[PDB]
Structure 1
Amino acid sequence: QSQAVAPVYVGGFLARYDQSPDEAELLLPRDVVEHWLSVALPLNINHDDTAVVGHVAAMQSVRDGLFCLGCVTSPRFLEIVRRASEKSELVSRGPVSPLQPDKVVEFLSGSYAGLSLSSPFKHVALCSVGRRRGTLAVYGRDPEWVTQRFPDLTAADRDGLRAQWDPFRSDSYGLLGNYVDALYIRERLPKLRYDKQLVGVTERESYVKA
């Protein structure tokens, strides 16, 4: 069991420039960011400030939007997620060809398949889809394994990050309650099955379930 309640790294885009944000406010041009960039802005479930599970390791805008890495730590949340994946036929099926099963990672990769910003910079959030477009969450045990999952990324902005990287007041009832709300986010797969094409990431080489 011990190789499950160990940190989980999640990485991805919080904004996508070359993507006209069809929605309101969410619009977010590089223009602010650099300027916009101390505190310990945390990582929570769909924003609930009583469901935090770690920190936003580090951020750093690059040629194609804003990118960040988190680090799920909540020795309680991870503990729920584990026994959760205990009974999830998606989890029991496993990852692809060469990748190795990681129950705790696969679950998080599937229930919260995307990141969502909120802002200096309030916080980052794991959710079932992203407000913006192309903010697919990529989970992993190793942060760099994660980083190289996104074709775009050069070496620099990668080593930019590499020169950077139990707050859980919730429960199975919290998680049970957020899931119903997500089961109705209209055609969640598209917005999702779109984001993995937007940044390259695919099921052939990552845990992304989308």
Structure 2
Amino acid sequence: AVAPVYVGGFLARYDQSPDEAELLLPRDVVEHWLALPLNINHDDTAVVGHVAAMQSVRDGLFCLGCVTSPRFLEIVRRASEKSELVSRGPVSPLQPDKVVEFLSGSYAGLSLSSRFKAVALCSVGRRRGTLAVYGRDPEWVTQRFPDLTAADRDGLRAQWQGDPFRSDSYGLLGNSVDALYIRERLPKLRYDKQLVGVTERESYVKA
């Protein structure tokens, strides 16, 4: 469980038009700019790992991150054991993985904060199509996305191939109540799941 956990997904979809103008992120700007810390919902006292790769592809900006913080993984491990959702396990093929499943359930989205400053794991991203996919092997995670080509993965593989977490369970729990009041949280996540062709039938995605 405490072993590293990889997370991948789109930080932005070019064909997607943001609601707020501030979330506009065109291809040329992204390509022009192309390690970023990985934190929990933009709280820089909650860094859990780092972005291990970023690739601008046909449909958007894809990234792969690695959750390495032992403190964070341990807190997650303990919490996962007290989750009814986690206890239900994944769908038929995949084998149970409490930590990966808790992470899939709690932080189902990605959020690129451009103050690029950091990638935050959050309950749902503010940009659509930013579903977060967790797994123990980065190849497997990248393979969860149909839009990526072999050439796309080669570029990503080339990249990914003191505990920074200064928060606690209390902080994560305080974050959880905020998550319950995010409007259209599940519909957004399902929309994202649809847009990137990821199913619960071949991943740990809970939405």
| TM-score normalised per structure 2 | 0.97
Task: Name stretches of at least 5 consecutive residues in structure 1 with no aligned partner.
Answer: none
Shift of 1:24: 2.3
Moved runs in structure 1, 4+ residues, more than 4 A?
A: none
3-state DSSP of counterpart to 1:158: helix
Q: Conserved in 2, the CA contact under 8 Å of 1:117 and 1:125? A: yes
Aligned to 1:173: 170
3-state DSSP of counterpart to 1:25: helix
Deviations 1:9-53 (A, max 9, x none): 00000001111112221110101011112xx21000001000000
Shift of 1:197: 0.5
Sequence identity (%)? 99
Shift of 1:91: 0.1
Alpha-carbon separation, structure 1, partners of 2:17 and 2:166: 36
Alpha-carbon separation, structure 2, partners of 1:179 and 1:147: 27
3-state DSSP of counterpart to 1:205: coil
Deviations 1:46-67 (A, max 9, x none): 0100000000011011000000
Aligned to 1:104: 99
Alpha-carbon separation, structure 2, partners of 1:90 and 1:24: 36
RMSD: 0.9
- CA gap of 1:120–1:46, structure 2 versus 1, over 3 A, is closer
- CA gap of 1:128–1:164, structure 2 versus 1, over 3 A, is same
Shift of 1:152: 0.6
Q: Conserved in 2, the CA contact under 8 Å of 1:43 and 1:54? A: yes
1:130 aligns with 2:103: no
Shift of 1:120: 8.3
Q: How many residues align?
A: 205
Alpha-carbon separation, structure 2, partners of 1:187 and 1:25: 20
Alpha-carbon separation, structure 1, partners of 2:93 and 2:41: 32
Task: Name stretches of at least 5 consecutive residues in structure 2 with no aligned partner.
Answer: none
3-state DSSP of counterpart to 1:160: helix
Query: Which structure features the higher share of helix residues?
Result: 2
Alpha-carbon separation, structure 2, partners of 1:146 and 1:60: 14
Alpha-carbon separation, structure 1, partners of 2:29 and 2:99: 36
Deviations 1:110-156 (A, max 9, x none): 00001000118101010000111010000000001000101110001
Q: Conserved in 2, the CA contact under 8 Å of 1:23 and 1:132? A: no
- CA gap of 1:180–1:127, structure 2 versus 1, over 3 A, is same
Q: Note the 1:1-210 alignment, pairs <5 A.
A: 4-37=1-34, 40-119=35-114, 121-165=116-160, 166-210=163-207
Deviations 1:61-107 (A, max 9, x none): 10000000010000000000001011111000000011100000000
Query: Which structure features the higher share of strand residues?
Result: 2
| TM-score normalised per structure 1 | 0.96
